[PDB]
Symmetry: D2
Amino acid sequence: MPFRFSPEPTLEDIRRLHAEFAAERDWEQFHQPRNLLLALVGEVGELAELFQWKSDTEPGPQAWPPKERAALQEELSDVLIYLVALAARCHVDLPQAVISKMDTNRQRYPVHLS
Amino acid sequence: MPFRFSPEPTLEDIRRLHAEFAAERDWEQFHQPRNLLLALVGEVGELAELFQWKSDTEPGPQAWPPKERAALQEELSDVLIYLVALAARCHVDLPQAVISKMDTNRQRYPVHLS
Amino acid sequence: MPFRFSPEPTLEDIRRLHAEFAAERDWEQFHQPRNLLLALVGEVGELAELFQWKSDTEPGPQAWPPKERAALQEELSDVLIYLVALAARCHVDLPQAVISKMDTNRQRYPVHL
Amino acid sequence: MPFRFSPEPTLEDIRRLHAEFAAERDWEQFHQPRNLLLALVGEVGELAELFQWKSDTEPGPQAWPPKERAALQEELSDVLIYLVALAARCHVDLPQAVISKMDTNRQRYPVHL
Ligand SMILES: Nc1ccn([C@H]2C[C@H](O)[C@@H](COP(=O)(O)O)O2)c(=O)n1
Ligand SMILES: Nc1ccn([C@H]2C[C@H](O)[C@@H](COP(=O)(O)O)O2)c(=O)n1
Ligand SMILES: Nc1ccn([C@H]2C[C@H](O)[C@@H](COP(=O)(O)O)O2)c(=O)n1
Ligand SMILES: Nc1ccn([C@H]2C[C@H](O)[C@@H](COP(=O)(O)O)O2)c(=O)n1
Ligand SMILES: [Mg+2]
Ligand SMILES: [Mg+2]
Ligand SMILES: [Mg+2]
Ligand SMILES: [Mg+2]
């Protein structure tokens, strides 16, 4: 059956949620751009660890066991949360940046040359 | 003045945009989970390169020159695009995964213990 | 007091040690190039975690506390071990590759500029 | 024909070579621990880029074409050079740390299990 994401939360919603979470704990001081970037790298590491010993032939993530699916959800989420936090801290409008990048991607790879 | 993201595109919008982009070029074959993960790692590398030689004291990303701001927008976007693609390819509902992770984050770090 | 690395183990020594370690456990099957690369990325993550919340002003790694020095030693080592394993699995002569790269680095960055 | 690394350069040799390279260009200022770490992450990205679109079935890195072998040598080397630089900047004796980690690895993964 066709797979889709839920319509919410949006990236703005996530930005706002993370900002409130950090503000309640007085963590703004820890959230400088290079801290957030290094935290992002750490979470990408954790995500990679889930895949590192998977063979070419064994079942893919759609079929992993419950505890492994849970970990996968969690690490994908941790990466997104820091990416949002980082983008916001740099005053980058991430949704609109993605539109611009996708337009650039189309120009670099025209369908008739691929 | 207060900074916010635009309300669109949503993560579902980005998922759909990337899927159409890949489908037009017959790239589904290249987009297996471990390919997407390695591409994500590559983009995180490019993002890190923008920050690597910045000193502690010099101005932050909010004040970088136009070409550096453009690169920053682009690499943040490339990371998000592959993260979305990866989540979708694993049938993870990324927005709802983030809600669950944020709830877990609150439980691990109660405000009165921090 | 001048800082230096110890003269051993060499990269070849590390290669041989890791290969024997893996061979004793019948782990050759797990050590394909893309597995090793992803494991390397994981260990780079662990290394980054040690630095992620450090401020500009607090003490630097030369002065970290004992437990943090120990963790730093361990994660730097984990990165090196997988890098060696990956290079060896690809039949790349890593020490000689480094010489070649350093030569190229000199050319790209002339001293007078 | 057995695969081995060359016996030189050693990690100490690489340390000394990189330190002189940086010192000649007055780059000590750029080489703070977190700069070196981020540069390392960048080079791990470049390494990953070489592998990212490879299929399961096409030839593996032992059999890659000449230009791809050259790139692989270079990116493996870039990762090693920054790892050495970072370890040295933190006054970590990387060869001896690796021995300690390998010992710990043996304990965590006993051969009989
Ligand atoms: N200083 C911190 C600590 C945690 N988190 C949030 C974001 C991640 O989703 C998660 C990571 O938590 P941990 O590093 O405890 O696993 O918690 C945060 O934003 N800032
Ligand atoms: N096989 C590919 C090649 C490119 N891209 C898209 C996603 C990134 O935003 C950007 C990366 O392009 P490049 O690797 O050419 O810089 O293009 C993709 O989804 N799949
Ligand atoms: N399949 C494995 C598991 C572990 N290790 C070694 C290399 C690292 O130095 C350390 C990583 O162990 P862990 O992932 O248990 O921390 O042990 C290895 O070579 N291959
Ligand atoms: N500030 C710098 C710039 C370059 N390099 C060296 C280490 C790497 O092997 C290579 C990276 O160069 P580039 O980033 O120009 O590819 O050159 C370095 O040690 N310090
Ligand atoms: Mg995590
Ligand atoms: Mg990019
Ligand atoms: Mg480790
Ligand atoms: Mg490089």
